[PDB]
């Protein structure tokens, strides 16, 4: 929930999440995502829903999103003959999802 | 994280969060029973 | 109209009382010219400008006029209980009786001063003139004088001083005489209900912006009619009058206009400061209170930050409120005007006599071996470390520096550490040293943050604008500065510090600022050893965390190290028990040195100067050859710190003319630069034991 | 002659006599404020040759007495009010009425319908006595306010007079009259003004936000302001937790006055403004104890044995510990305080540390150390920003004047701080509490404000062993994690064990199982009057002993234990006199220094 | 839809459904006003029984005696309560590409604090 532009009430928004509701959820290059919005996404897609506690306003909206995904491998083209989760940052409870 | 761990491992014992940060001191109140699924490491042999 | 604005009478008669007060000004006994007749014509003769009025000696003219009577009305709670309008009628008082020429007013002498004698001459003409025409046409000879006064208009009073008048209250003596005026007050303790009195305060001074004119009564001049038009200024702002008043502009046709002269005007030093509670006063719960006081004319730049002074004054309103939607009204969001300030903590070096003030000195020096007896009357609250004192004396003296000429300074003053722990009270001598000395200022690193020491830029009220404003360095110099926890301030305090051994110096480049300010700060610091404590297995330099890039700036370092002794440890027993026991510690016997004459004492002392013998010079040098050679046949650690680099030679040199002047010197003799050697051996080497 | 006098007023106070004349206790009240007076007016006058003038009125009294008049104020304070406090004043000028005024009233209550909390409030509860309860926050500087002027007329001699009506005088609307300020008399004559005979009166206004323990789970606050004059200025400060009973006023024009949305500013006038006490705020012990609490102290302090029981007092649910327990009493004491003549003070508290592995109760301890401490904050691990600190709050707040935000530490201030998970507190704080503790003063140089303000803070440190449950077996260091000064700063470093034994077990079992199926009330009591009354100071019975005890400390133990510093000597000073604290003794005693000794032995041993 | 609101639909009545961002502190209208002139001395009263945010009604202009020299009397005059509630439309759906919309409402007595933000 952020102070708008020029002067303005404030008004809530959504993350591409809430905003893409029972649509198509496109991102890339999750591992150059800071850990404030990988929370979020873990978020979504666990129970399928956003909760905002802030400001005074309190919710869950509602994200049912399939999310697409573009993920770069740690290093090289492939970084080893180690495992998937090996070869990339990605934790991976995250990936199991 | 750490910060809010230390928060919840006071909690759930005294069933009460205090907060002395600036001018509010307050003491309010928890009476929540934590239900926790935590996520072990390396599978199998953690049971080793 | 009655019956609207209806009249009150009251105990108070003004019609008396200034005939009381002429009685008294100009005519007077205690203290064969009276005080009153001969300051005023120190006055008259130009040479004194603020006239200071006491309240005291109007004590004693009551019971001189007492006893000895007949009964005159009671000035003082007259004066006390209202202050403002007094200042006013007691000026008018003195105005008429003065000594009349006095003096020719040369060349220079002084500008504003010929202005205000040619108002006066003016003033006179314009009557002799008037006089001289009316008894021209004629048809008891002091009716016609009335009638000449009556009809003319010349320069009030008001307009033409030249000086100020303040007041100072009573304490003291003569509250005891028994005779309220002043009862230091915290700012708490000030109620909304004494506005108008004349009271006295104990406070923080904190801010004090920069002094600038403001004007009382504003000068123009019409031109066409001639004449000038004054008009009276108040509060913060004023509208500039236009078109006319002259009396020879009214009910003409056409009214001139007039434009104001700058020089012609009335002007006061106006600067105004705040003071805080002085933190002890303060309730257990809660925050100091701040309180906004007013500066005008000779009293200005009497006052500066981290100062705890008594302000006595005038206790005046001025009209504010804060959102006007927040105002029931008429409210008045006050201030207090300042007559007269007395500092605690008298301020060195400044000072002419020096006059019978040499005999509080004396009490101190004929007993002998002052230095000894003040060492030891430093802080002696605490047991021990009597060769610690011994050198806090000198840091509190400092001196001499130099000036090659050219030139460039070399400090200058003492830079002292303590190191050692946990206990040992290192820090109580800095809370005794910074308690001692004036313009010493306490501080610790998180604690005091990097822009604590450094000033930065904020826009000021009121007068403007965007000045720099420092702290702690900045705040305190010209006196010593204290630090504690001097380990934990992390890096960016340091290379500050690192540098301020340069002296005279803090260069601030970032954004808004390129000033470079001076700090002439003392620095005292006290400091623990790498943990626990000063592990004997590690040698010097490690178990010290600090860099040799900073000690060698220092020239004397206590290692204050604890180790065990069944003998001593019952004495300190029996101190530490003595006291609490008792408040007062040293008996049987010495006298311990009263901060206040001991202040004075060093006050006297900084005044001296004194120069090296060439004796003692050729000593120096060759001792100091066997110091760096010594210091580093030392070669590789243990022992150390190496390499008594030349700043530990100019240090020694600078302790030596340090200790000269407690002897007061400028002989500065070998059993001076010796006994420098031997503080500065018995600093360290106490590792040994 | 005003208005002339009403039969509806008339009656209203007259009517409002027998009560107060019954309840009679009232009567001799007010008498009694005069006396007060009188004697200090005595004190001024003669010595060297005051209090508030608004009785308490408890509401419970008129419900009986009068049930009309009653819901009367209630419902109509501003028609039973004035009469009212007329009636107070004509008694009040009765009482004693030779030598030579409002008097307020309180109302005390039994409230209320009328008991409601700043979140529910208006518009029916509008315009009616209202009891209204929470945080005091953001307060305000307090303005003097101009009431009546004089002048000096030259050259005709004289003075004069005016009055100022502003809209929240009386209670009841006024058609207002603006006075200007008056100057230029006429005749033409100027007029200078005087002050200190024009009386003021001081003024203050605090808003009132619900209270946030009662709050409800998350929402915006919403605050109501309260204007505060008088007696009644200051009393509190920004942060305490506060009951305010006065009118509810809808004072001004809403905009319907102007012709050319928001409307009818409201407020409330007055008028009792309780500070009370609420869990780590504002005081408040506070506390009454009458004639028989008093002599139950009295006859209990001469018993011999009282320490133990006492000790024993603290711990219903809690096994042994009881070294533990005798010292939080012993911090409560505290060994007074001492202020060296133009010197520094020696540290008056005790401060303690536990330490032992989990299940040991530190941090169950800990809160019935703040139940019956009489204030202070907690504080737990991170905890922060500023622990006690002011912060030295930018920007503004308001008009742009800098001012300071006490953070806990200093607004725990002759209290007890607790810290829980002492060891995960940041270093970086620590070297601050270095600063509270010993020291005893905290300073702020920040920016900004520039001043040494004081926190003498009384603490009590639960930290966690270093790794794991290791603390039992470990070295006596390297087991703290915390070094070093800090180890030392602490008077007393107590440590427990959770190690394991059959026996133990069983003793243990039986009174948990009870637990689930001398009194705590009496504590604090007993816990105040020893307080301020009174201080041991010291004696030369103990001196020898607590010598003897140091020097046998550090010779021995530096080759046994650690750490040993003088600071150990102050402490077994400040343990003998709280010690004696307890005794109630004028005086300190051998036998007090003896028990120092001990409990400083089973820290160490 | 909230995003779809003709100006033909002014004046009638509309329902539409989204959710609150914000609800306002509370205010006082008065209903019921008890007046007074005060150079006049006469005595009367405005009653206003309903009200949108118009301004509805306001003090008469005469009892010379004038400009309106009516004062209210504060002791006779009966309040109520106003809210300001501020809605938005479901951040859901559908900007997609914009600072999704919101209307201002107002509620008078008893449909006030009947609700928390964030209810939809
Ligand atoms: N010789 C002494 N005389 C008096 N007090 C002492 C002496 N040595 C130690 N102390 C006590 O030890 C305490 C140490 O306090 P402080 O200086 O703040 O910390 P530190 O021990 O780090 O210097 C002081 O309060 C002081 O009372
Ligand atoms: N001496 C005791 N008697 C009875 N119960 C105890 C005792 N010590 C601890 N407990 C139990 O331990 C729990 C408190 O744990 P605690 O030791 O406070 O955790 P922490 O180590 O985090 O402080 C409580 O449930 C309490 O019942």
Same mark, same amino acid.
């Given at each position: ?97 | ?48 | ?20 007060? #002429? ?310 969001? #006050? ?5 007269? *300030? ?11 006599? #020096? ?87 306490? #501080? ?176 120096? *040098? ?57 503080? *500065? ?9 | ?83 009212? $406090? ?46 209204? $309860? ?124 102007? %012709? ?40 209990? %302090? ?5 320490? =133990?029981?006492?000790?024993? %007092?603290?711990? &219903?649910?809690?096994?042994?510990? =009881? ?97 829980? $998970? ?48 290791? =603390?039992?077996?470990?070295? &006596? ?129 | ?21 914000? +609800? ?19 005595? +009367? ?66 449909? +006030? ?5 964030? +209810?939809?």
């Amino acid at each position: 929930v952020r102070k708008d532009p020029i002067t303005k009430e404030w008004t809530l928004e959504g993350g591409a999440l809430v905003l893409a509701d029972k649509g198509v959820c496109l991102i890339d290059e999750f591992d150059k995502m800071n850990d404030q919005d990988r929370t979020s996404i873990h978020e979504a897609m666990e129970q399928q829903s956003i909760s905002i506690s802030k400001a005074g306003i309190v919710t869950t909206l509602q994200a049912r999103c399939s999310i697409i995904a573009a993920a770069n491998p740690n290093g090289g083209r492939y970084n080893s003959t180690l495992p998937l989760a090996q070869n990339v940052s990605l934790t991976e409870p995250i990936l199991s999802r | 994280r750490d910060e809010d761990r230390v928060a919840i491992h006071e909690a759930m014992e005294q069933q009460t969060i205090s907060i002395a940060k600036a001018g509010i001191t307050t003491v309010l109140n928890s009476r929540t029973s934590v239900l926790a699924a935590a996520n072990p490491i390396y599978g199998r042999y953690d049971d080793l | 109209m009655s019956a609207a604005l209806p009249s009150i009478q009251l105990p108070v008669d003004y019609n008396n009382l200034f005939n009381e007060i #002429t009685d008294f000004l100009v005519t007077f006994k205690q203290d064969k010219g009276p005080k009153y007749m001969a300051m005023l014509q120190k006055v008259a003769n130009r040479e004194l400008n603020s006239v200071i009025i006491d309240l005291d000696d109007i004590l004693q003219y009551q019971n001189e006029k007492f006893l000895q009577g007949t009964q005159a009305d009671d000035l003082v709670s007259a004066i006390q209980q209202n202050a403002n309008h007094f200042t006013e009628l007691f000026c008018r008082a003195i105005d008429n009786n003065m000594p009349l020429p006095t003096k020719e007013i040369d060349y220079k002498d002084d500008v504003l001063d010929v202005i205000l004698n040619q108002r006066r001459l003016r003033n006179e003409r314009m009557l002799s003139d008037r006089t001289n025409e009316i008894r021209s046409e004629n048809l008891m000879n002091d009716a016609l004088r009335e009638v000449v006064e009556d009809e003319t208009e010349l320069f009030p009073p008001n307009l033409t001083r030249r000086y100020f008048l303040y007041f100072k209250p009573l304490s003291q003596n003569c509250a005891r005489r028994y005779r309220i005026s002043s009862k230091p007050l915290s700012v708490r303790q000030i109620k909304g209900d004494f506005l108008g009195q004349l009271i006295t305060v104990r406070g923080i001074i904190t801010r004090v912006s920069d002094v600038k004119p403001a004007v009382e009564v504003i000068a123009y001049t019409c031109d066409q009619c001639g004449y000038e038009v004054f008009q009276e200024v108040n509060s913060r702002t004023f509208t500039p009058l236009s078109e006319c008043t002259s009396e020879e502009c009214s009910q003409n046709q056409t009214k001139g206009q007039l434009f104001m002269s700058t020089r012609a005007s009335k002007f006061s030093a106006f600067q105004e400061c705040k003071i805080q509670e002085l933190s002890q006063q303060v309730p257990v719960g809660h925050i100091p209170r701040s309180l906004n006081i007013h500066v005008n004319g000779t009293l200005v730049r009497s006052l500066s930050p981290g100062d705890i002074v008594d302000v006595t004054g005038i206790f005046l309103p001025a009209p504010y409120t804060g959102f006007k939607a927040l105002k029931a009204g008429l409210l008045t969001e #006050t201030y207090l005007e300042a007559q007269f *300030v007395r500092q605690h903590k008298k301020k060195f070096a400044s000072f002419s006599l #020096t006059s019978d003030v040499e005999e509080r000195v004396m009490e101190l020096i004929t007993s002998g071996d002052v230095y000894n007896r003040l060492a030891k009357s430093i802080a002696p609250e605490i047991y021990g470390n009597l060769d610690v004192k011994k050198a806090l004396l000198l840091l509190l003296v400092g001196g001499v520096d130099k000036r090659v000429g050219d030139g460039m300074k070399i400090r200058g003053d003492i830079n002292v550490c303590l190191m050692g722990d946990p206990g040992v009270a290192k820090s109580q001598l800095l809370k005794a040293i910074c308690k001692i000395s004036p313009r010493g200022v306490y #501080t610790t690193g998180k604690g005091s943050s990097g822009v604590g020491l450094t000033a930065a830029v904020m826009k000021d009220p009121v007068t403007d604008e965007m000045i720099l404003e420092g702290g702690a360095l900045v705040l305190a110099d010209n006196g010593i500065c204290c630090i504690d926890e001097f380990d934990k301030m992390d890096e960016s305090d340091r290379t500050a510090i690192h540098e301020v051994m340069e002296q005279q110096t803090i260069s601030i480049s970032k954004a808004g600022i390129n000033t470079t300010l001076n700090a002439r700060t003392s620095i005292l610091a006290a400091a623990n050893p790498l943990y626990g404590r000063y592990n004997p297995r590690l040698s010097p330099l490690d178990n010290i965390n600090l860099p040799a890039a900073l000690l060698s700036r220092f020239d004397i370092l206590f290692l204050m190290l604890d180790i065990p002794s069944r003998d001593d440890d019952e004495k300190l027993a029996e101190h530490v028990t003595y006291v609490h026991m008792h408040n007062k510690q040293p008996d049987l016997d010495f006298t311990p040195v009263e901060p206040s004459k001991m202040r004075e004492y060093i006050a006297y002392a900084k005044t001296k100067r004194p120069v090296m013998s060439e004796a003692v010079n050729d000593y120096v *040098v060759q001792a100091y050859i066997r110091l760096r050679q010594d210091s580093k046949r030392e070669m590789d650690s243990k022992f150390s710190f190496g390499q008594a680099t030349p700043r530990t030679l100019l240090g020694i040199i600078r302790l030596s003319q340090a200790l000269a002047k407690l002897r007061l010197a400028d002989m500065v003799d070998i059993d001076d630069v010796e006994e420098a050697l031997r503080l *500065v051996r018995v600093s360290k080497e106490s590792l040994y034991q | 002659t005003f208005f002339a006098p009403d039969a509806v007023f008339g009656d209203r106070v007259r009517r409002f006599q027998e009560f107060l004349d019954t309840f009679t206790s009232y009567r001799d009240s007010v008498r009694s404020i005069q006396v007060y007076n009188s004697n200090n007016a005595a004190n001024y006058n003669d010595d060297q040759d005051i209090l508030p003038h608004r009785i308490i009125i408890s509401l419970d009294d008129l419900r009986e007495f009068d049930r009309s008049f009653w819901s009367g104020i209630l419902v109509e304070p501003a028609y039973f009010i004035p009469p009212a $406090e007329k009636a107070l004043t004509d008694l009040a000028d009765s009482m004693d009425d030779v030598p030579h005024h409002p008097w307020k009233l309180s109302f005390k209550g039994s409230f209320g319908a009328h008991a409601l909390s700043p979140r529910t409030l208006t518009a029916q509860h509008l315009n009616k006595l209202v009891s209204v $309860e929470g945080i005091v926050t953001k307060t305000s500087l307090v303005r003097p306010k101009l009431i009546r002027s004089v002048h000096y007329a030259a050259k005709t001699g004289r003075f004069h007079y005016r009055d100022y009506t502003d809209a929240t005088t009386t209670l009841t609307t006024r058609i207002p009259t603006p006075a200007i300020y008056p100057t230029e008399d006429t005749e033409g004559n100027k007029l200078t003004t005087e002050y200190g005979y024009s009386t003021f009166i001081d003024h203050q206004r605090i808003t009132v936000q619900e209270m946030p323990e009662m709050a409800p789970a998350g929402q915006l606050p919403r605050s109501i302001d309260v204007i505060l004059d008088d007696d009644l200025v200051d009393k509190t400060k920004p942060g305490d937790r506060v009951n305010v009973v006065g009118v509810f006023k809808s004072l001004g024009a809403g905009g319907m006055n102007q %012709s050319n949305l928001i409307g009818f500013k409201t407020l409330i006038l007055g008028n009792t403004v309780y500070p009370l006490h609420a869990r780590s705020t504002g005081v408040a012990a506070r506390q009454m104890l009458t004639d028989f609490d008093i002599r139950n102290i009295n006859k209990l %302090s001469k018993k011999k044995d009282i320490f =133990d029981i006492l000790s024993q %007092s603290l711990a &219903p649910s809690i096994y042994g510990h =009881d070294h533990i327990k005798k010292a939080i009493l012993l911090m409560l004491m505290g060994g007074v305080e001492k202020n060296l003549e133009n010197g520094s003070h020696l540290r008056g508290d005790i401060n303690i540390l536990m330490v032992g592995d989990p299940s040991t109760a530190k941090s169950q301890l800990l809160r019935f150390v703040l139940n019956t401490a009489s204030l202070a904050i907690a504080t737990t691990g991170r905890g922060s920003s500023g622990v006690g600190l002011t912060a030295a709050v930018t920007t503004d707040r308001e008009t742009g004047e800098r001012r300071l935000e006490a953070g806990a530490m200093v607004l725990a201030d002759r209290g007890v701080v607790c810290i829980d $998970e002492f060891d995960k507190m940041t270093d970086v704080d620590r070297v601050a509490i270095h600063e509270v503790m010993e020291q005893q003063t905290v300073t702020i140089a920040k920016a900004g404000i520039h001043t040494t303000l004081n926190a003498r803070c009384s603490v009590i440190a639960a930290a966690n062993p270093v790794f794991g449950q290791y =603390d039992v077996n470990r070295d &006596p260091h390297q087991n703290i994690a915390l070094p070093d000064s800090l180890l030392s700063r602490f008077d007393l470093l107590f440590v427990v064990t959770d190690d394991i034994n059959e026996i133990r077990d069983r003793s243990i079992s039986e009174h948990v199982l009870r637990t689930h199926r001398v009194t705590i009330p009496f504590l604090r009591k007993y816990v105040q009057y020893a307080k301020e009354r009174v201080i041991p100071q010291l004696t030369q019975e103990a001196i020898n002993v607590i010598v003897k005890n140091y020097t046998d400390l550090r010779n021995d133990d530096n080759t046994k234990k650690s750490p040993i510093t003088a600071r150990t000597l102050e402490t077994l000073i400040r343990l003998a006199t709280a010690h004696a604290k307890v005794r109630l003794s004028k005086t300190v005693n051998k036998v007090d220094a003896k028990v120092a000794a001990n409990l400083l032995r089973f820290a160490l041993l | 839809p909230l995003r779809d609101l003709d100006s033909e639909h002014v004046s009638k009545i509309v329902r539409l459904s989204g959710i609150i961002i914000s +609800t306002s502190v509370l205010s006082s209208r008065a209903t019921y006003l008890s007046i007074m002139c005060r150079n006049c001395r006469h005595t +009367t009263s405005i009653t206003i029984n309903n009200f949108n945010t118009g301004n509805t009604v306001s003090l008469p202009r005469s009892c010379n005696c004038g400009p309106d020299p009516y004062i209210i009397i504060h002791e006779s005059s009966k309040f109520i309560d106003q809210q300001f509630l501020k809605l938005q439309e479901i951040p859901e759906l559908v900007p997609v590409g914009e600072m999704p919309r919101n209307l201002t409402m107002t509620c008078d007595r008893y449909l +006030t604090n009947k609700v928390i933000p964030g +209810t939809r």
